[PDB]
Every structure is written in C-alpha cells, then in structure tokens.
Enzyme design. Structure first.
Site, PDB file in Angstrom:
ATOM      1  N   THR A  62      -3.170  -2.864  -2.665  1.00  0.00           N
ATOM      2  CA  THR A  62      -2.649  -3.608  -3.696  1.00  0.00           C
ATOM      3  C   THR A  62      -1.736  -4.605  -2.879  1.00  0.00           C
ATOM      4  O   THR A  62      -1.124  -4.452  -1.936  1.00  0.00           O
ATOM      5  CB  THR A  62      -1.943  -2.852  -4.855  1.00  0.00           C
ATOM      6  OG1 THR A  62      -1.064  -1.737  -4.343  1.00  0.00           O
ATOM      7  CG2 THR A  62      -2.981  -2.146  -5.450  1.00  0.00           C
ATOM      8  N   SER A  63      -1.424  -5.752  -3.824  1.00  0.00           N
ATOM      9  CA  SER A  63      -0.162  -6.747  -3.161  1.00  0.00           C
ATOM     10  C   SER A  63       0.962  -6.084  -3.470  1.00  0.00           C
ATOM     11  O   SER A  63       1.068  -5.495  -4.641  1.00  0.00           O
ATOM     12  CB  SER A  63      -0.549  -7.972  -3.846  1.00  0.00           C
ATOM     13  OG  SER A  63       0.053  -8.777  -3.090  1.00  0.00           O
ATOM     14  N   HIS A  77       2.260  -1.127   3.758  1.00  0.00           N
ATOM     15  CA  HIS A  77       1.464  -0.039   3.197  1.00  0.00           C
ATOM     16  C   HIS A  77       1.347   0.965   4.504  1.00  0.00           C
ATOM     17  O   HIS A  77       1.229   0.377   5.427  1.00  0.00           O
ATOM     18  CB  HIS A  77       0.184  -0.329   2.623  1.00  0.00           C
ATOM     19  CG  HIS A  77       0.248  -0.888   1.098  1.00  0.00           C
ATOM     20  ND1 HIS A  77       0.725  -0.116   0.310  1.00  0.00           N
ATOM     21  CD2 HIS A  77      -0.267  -1.993   0.715  1.00  0.00           C
ATOM     22  CE1 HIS A  77       0.562  -1.020  -0.864  1.00  0.00           C
ATOM     23  NE2 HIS A  77      -0.012  -1.966  -0.710  1.00  0.00           N
ATOM     24  N   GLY A  78       1.137   2.335   4.222  1.00  0.00           N
ATOM     25  CA  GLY A  78       0.895   2.949   5.251  1.00  0.00           C
ATOM     26  C   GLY A  78       0.599   4.370   4.868  1.00  0.00           C
ATOM     27  O   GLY A  78       0.513   4.422   3.540  1.00  0.00           O
ATOM     28  N   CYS A  98       4.341   3.953   2.647  1.00  0.00           N
ATOM     29  CA  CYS A  98       4.224   5.132   2.218  1.00  0.00           C
ATOM     30  C   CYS A  98       3.632   6.069   3.213  1.00  0.00           C
ATOM     31  O   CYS A  98       3.421   5.531   4.578  1.00  0.00           O
ATOM     32  CB  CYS A  98       2.808   4.976   1.303  1.00  0.00           C
ATOM     33  SG  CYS A  98       3.492   4.433  -0.392  1.00  0.00           S
TER      34      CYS A  98
END
EC number: 3.4.22.56
Lengths: 140, 7, 90, 90, 140, 7
Positions: free
Chosen positions: A28-29, A87-88, A129
C-alpha cells in the site's frame, strides 16, 4: 568514554523515503511519509548534519546509493546517519519494486569496508514493519 | 493510522 | 575492534511487529524521534534520548482503525546498540 | 502500555555470531558484565553500564585458538532495549 | 524518567547454568561456565538481588522454571533479572536435551501475563551463541 | 577460549 564529535563536520544523514510501490509488491501507499521526511530534514539540519532526501528508489537503487555513500570519504566527519522509511519485514527493507536484506545495506558501512568511518558511530534509523504481530496493550 | 504486508 | 562495533540500529518497532503510521502527522516513531531530538539533543546522551522516544510512543499513541482487528493497538520501538561509547551531539 | 514494553535483552554477542568463552575465567561477556557492575552500579545508569561492557569486550579480548579459522577473532555484545525509562540500581 | 527502584526488594535474579549436554544435541561441554555463574552470583548478591542458581536443566525444565517464576508475585520487588548461560542459535536457547525459542521464555514475563511485573524492568542476560559467523576485527 | 554448534 564518549565519541569525538568535534570533527570538522557532523556528518552525512541519508533519508530514503519510499511512499509508492509497484503493483508487483502488493504494498500500500504510505500516506503521511512526506511529513516524516520533512520533519527529519529540519531536525537533522539543525543538528548540523548534511541531509539528502531520496524519493521512491527501487531496491537496486537502494543498494547503489549505499555503496556510493560507503565509498565517499567521511574523515572530516564525526558520525554517519541513515534513515530508512519504507515497508519491510523482519531483517528486510522494501525498495519500490521488492525486498532487500537490511544486512546487505549495513555491511557496506562495516569497519573493514568503510575505513573513514571505522571507530565512529553509524546510526541506522529504520521506520519499517518487521513482521505482522499486533500489540493489544495492558491496563495500568 | 496505517501499518508499514498482510500475513 | 570488531567489524560489527559502533553500529546503532534504532528500529521503529519490536521484532516481528507491524510499525504504525499516521496519515497526517507521519509515523508514530519519526514524529517522536524528532520532537525528542529537538528538546534534548543539547542535554542528553543519545541512548537516553532514544529511551524518551520509547516512552513517548508507548504512552501517547494508540491505533484508531475502522477494522476490528486493528483497533486500540500499541507500539514500542527497539534500540539495538553495538556502540562502545556514549554519543553526544554537542 | 504495550505488552512488549520494559524488556531489556543484553545479548552476549551480535546476531548471527558465535559467543566466545574462556575455559578458566568464563565467558568474555559475563567476565565483563560483573567487573563493570562492580565498579559502576552505584554511579551509572544501566544503559551506560552495558555500554562499558560493550567497550570492554570489543577492546580487551581476542581469541586464541589452535585452529586457523578460529584464531585472532573478536566480539561485541548487543544491547536490545525496549525500556521506557532510565534504570538505576540505587 | 527513571524506574522506581525503592521497592521493598530489589527482585529476583535467576541464573540458568548449562555446561553438559546430551549426546543427542552434539553440543560440547562449556568449560569455564562455573566461574561465570559464581561471578554472577556474588555480583548480583551485592546488588541486593535474590540469586537462584539452577544447573543442567533440560528444555522442559527451562520452560517449567520460567512459568513458575512468572507465577510468583513480585509486587514487593523493583525489577526481574534472568541470566541464561547456554549454547544457543539465533532466537534459541539450548536445554541439556535440545533447543527452545527465546520468545517462549520471555513471553511468560509479558505485561499482560505477569502483572506483578507490569511497568517494571525485566532484564534478560543471555550468554549463548546466536549463529556461526566470526568477527575478524580491524586495525586501529 | 571456546565458542557457545558447528555450521
């Protein structure tokens, strides 16, 4: 007892800000992340760090940028800061096009591989994350 | 309020 | 000196957990890291600053979600230090 | 308050690495943790004490091994803090 | 700003000392580890902690001991310390008879599961391998 | 000088 922060320059602070990801990743953005990189920019500016914002890098662009910063000479600098906003997953940061191991990004700044940084603090700040657990809290 | 994938 | 020495990893969240972010104000951890650096970078050692960030996120934030499973959720950042000395910004 | 808050994990070694131990004196990290607690528990905050341990192991120890691949090897402990306040023992 | 260390007792300090392992594990004996548990015993004694040494526990004995300490009431105590001296791997500590996840040992002291410890520092000191990399050092 | 398995 304390690191020498009296070098000619405070040092380099790299901000990698990723908000929009390829459809291939399903990610997601990240609305709100412009604020983050702008709050970090002014905060590290006033701490006398050289701030470079980079936007929406693929994961080969992330590894490229890091090897090139590792190859610059920091000898007139006290510390090195790297801010990853993505993100991760656990041990992993996402380029716009997919994942890369965090250890590949940071092994470039190891003492035996970035000698103008040996003996100096290298600070990685990682908003990402690291899995999918949720904290439900407690009463206090 | 967002998170930084869905397991 | 080990090649892994003098590395400090300030993670936004605990291992295994999502990290939370607000659509208007930014991520709970980056909001808190700058606000504490602002008020404290001239006084405190870095570890103590990051400890105030930890307290800030743990106390001031709770998730608001239209989703049952995502509502009323909390967060704690995670300081990983291989530093061998204290770190001051002045 | 998150359920993960107020946890402090003082690992003897970095993630992925062996931990080293001396057959007569004990593990490099436990030797160093007690010697620093002795000299500093009445003065310093816990994080700063653990930071002296980090410095002690990184500087004073190198492996002696009859094995080529195990000789002249170094170590750094790893402080993982989810603490939200400073920790004093007095 | 600082944890209340003015409780009636400093708290509990558990030392789990494992030196000899079943043939099934392939783990070598940990010579020198008696010294460690005796150096830790006197150090935490003088810090006014209640020290309990346990020797050569299997991994079900390790999970049993931890759940029972989690079930004691620590309300008159400031902190909780747990010292694990074993072989291990990443995320894992070895009983005498095999491995157990570190997260299973520490989720017993989570705030929502050990309420006489909620809001207080819980300190895990873990002498244990976390993998098999070796540090070759640098010149300085 | 010992380590705390063989990979």
């Amino acid at each position: 007892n304390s690191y020498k922060m009296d070098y000619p320059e405070m040092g380099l602070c790299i901000i990698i800000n990723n908000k929009n990801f390829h459809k291939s990743t399903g990610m997601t953005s990240r609305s709100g992340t412009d604020v983050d990189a702008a709050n970090l920019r002014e905060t590290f500016r006033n701490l006398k760090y050289e701030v470079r914002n980079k936007n929406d890098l693929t994961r080969e662009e992330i590894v490229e940028l890091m090897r090139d910063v590792s190859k610059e000479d920091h000898s007139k600098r006290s510390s090195f800061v790297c801010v990853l906003l993505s993100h991760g997953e656990e041990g992993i940061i996402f380029g716009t096009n997919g994942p890369v191991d965090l250890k590949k990004i940071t092994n470039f700044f190891r003492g035996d591989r970035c000698r103008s940084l040996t003996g100096k603090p290298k600070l990685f700040i990682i908003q990402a994350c690291r899995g999918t657990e949720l904290d439900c809290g407690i009463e206090t | 309020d967002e998170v930084x994938a869905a397991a | 000196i080990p090649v892994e020495a003098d590395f400090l990893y300030a993670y936004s969240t605990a291992p295994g957990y999502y990290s939370w972010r607000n659509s208007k104000d930014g991520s709970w951890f980056i909001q808190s890291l700058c606000a504490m650096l602002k008020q404290y970078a001239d006084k405190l050692e870095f570890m103590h600053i990051l400890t105030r960030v930890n307290r800030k996120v743990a106390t001031e934030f709770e998730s608001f979600s239209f989703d049952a499973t995502f509502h009323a959720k909390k967060q704690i950042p995670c300081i990983v230090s291989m530093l061998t000395k204290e770190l001051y910004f002045y």
